[PDB]
Design a protein around this ligand. Structure first.
Ligand code: 0K9
Length: 375
């Protein structure tokens, strides 16, 4: 094992809609577990007690390197939650860098709507910053430990691929140039808590929504591999849905389809992709008055579920914009913590369309970009 980037290519798996996971080991001797990759939280936590949905769990008693921190912890996500006991142990990523680190681990003893029946993961790796860690920001997140204890550079990249089985790559400590095409375009990380960014403009089929750009970032915009959907603030959501409805009005949809509560189905291979618009999100750039855009295909926001059946993967939010897994899919996303920026490029595993392509394009000029941030 060398820790070379090729060794990390294709190291992610998942079941559709159930999250992307990476293989990790905890303890001595090493206990193998599959771990959800979550850029939207900052705690490393594993099942540590039997649960109807867990096929295996962390057995602290069998680890000679386990150290109790004698402190309890709970984490409330949007719907799911867990509580457990804090400890430290030795952690490796088999298809990752050739290193072992001692990291904080929350041993989950009780949970509510957290684990998923048949997901094949037993834990969560929160890759965001200490500021949002529980119980508080003194609990050092895994990636901070990794960088502090080793020579692994302070960055990682994610290539989330489509299809049902899903796959992808987490390149730890760098950028693998075989995984994307064209140029990487970078947006600043506004604040190190969530991976917070600033959207400066939104277009749907080349037509500007013409909203006050503050609305796009009310009350924040984040990049979150642990959230499935594109989530949009109420006002933006309504404008977007009105526009997508009108673009696709030649077709008949249930009312609860647009709410994400119903499926729409078409005769296998007759999905009318052309009637659903592309969405362009413009992100603040690296230089003065400069931005770039990422363009989202309808194949990203109509999520296939088991004729071809789809859920609407844009949902209303009262907690800000979330660029979830459906947005990240078909892009190569670089979380360059070292230079406080997030990079985007067209992925090698790009989502196909007959006549359109997901794109990352620039430079664009955009005045008063700082006004777009919510305060
Ligand atoms: C299900 O997705 C919902 C939106 C979700 O809560 N996902 C989790 C991670 C997680 C946890 C459990 C299961 C999953 C998945 N299920 C299916 C696929 S992934 C994912 C993800 O961490 C959410 N990130 C933000 C997403 C937001 C919305 C804006 C911030 O809400 C959150 N609220 C609380 C937390 C936990 C904190 C950091 C406060 C301790 C985080 C977040």
């Amino acid at each position: 094992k060398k820790g070379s980037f090729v060794e990390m290519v294709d190291n992610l798996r998942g079941k559709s809609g159930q999250g992307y996971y990476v293989e990790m080991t905890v303890g001595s001797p090493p206990q193998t577990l599959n771990i959800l990759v979550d850029t939207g939280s900052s705690n490393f936590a594993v099942g540590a007690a039997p649960h109807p949905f867990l096929h295996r769990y962390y057995q602290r008693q069998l680890s000679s390197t386990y150290r109790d921190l004698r402190k309890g912890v709970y984490v409330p996500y949007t719907q799911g939650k867990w509580e457990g006991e804090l400890g430290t142990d030795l952690v490796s990523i088999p298809h990752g860098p050739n290193v072992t680190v001692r990291a904080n681990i929350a041993a989950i003893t009780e949970s509510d709507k957290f684990f998923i029946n048949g997901s094949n993961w037993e834990g969560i790796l929160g890759l965001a910053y200490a500021e949002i860690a529980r119980p508080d920001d003194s609990l050092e997140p895994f990636f901070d430990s990794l960088v502090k204890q080793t020579h692994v550079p302070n960055l990682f990249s994610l290539q989330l691929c489509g299809a049902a089985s899903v796959g992808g790559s987490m390149i730890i400590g760098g950028i693998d140039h075989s995984l994307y095409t064209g140029s990487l375009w970078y947006t600043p990380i506004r604040r190190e808590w969530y991976y917070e960014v600033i959207i400066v403009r939104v277009e749907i089929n080349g037509q500007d929504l013409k909203m006050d750009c503050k609305e796009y970032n009310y009350d924040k915009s984040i990049v979150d591999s642990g959230t499935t959907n594109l989530r949009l603030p109420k006002k933006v959501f309504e404008a977007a849905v009105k526009s997508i409805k009108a673009a696709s009005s030649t077709e008949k949809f249930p009312d609860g389809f647009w709410l994400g509560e119903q499926l729409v189905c078409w005769q296998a291979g007759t999905t009318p992709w052309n009637i659903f618009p592309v969405i362009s999100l413009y992100l603040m750039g690296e230089v003065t008055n400069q931005s770039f855009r990422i363009t989202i295909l309808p194949q990203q926001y109509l999520r296939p579920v088991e004729d071809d059946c789809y859920k609407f993967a844009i949902s209303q939010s009262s907690t800000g914009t979330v660029m979830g897994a459906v947005i990240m899919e078909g892009f190569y996303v670089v979380f360059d913590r070292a230079r406080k920026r997030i990079g985007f490029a067209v992925s090698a595993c790009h989502v196909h369309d007959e006549f359109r392509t997901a794109a990352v394009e620039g430079p664009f000029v955009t005045l008063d970009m700082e006004d777009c941030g919510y305060n």
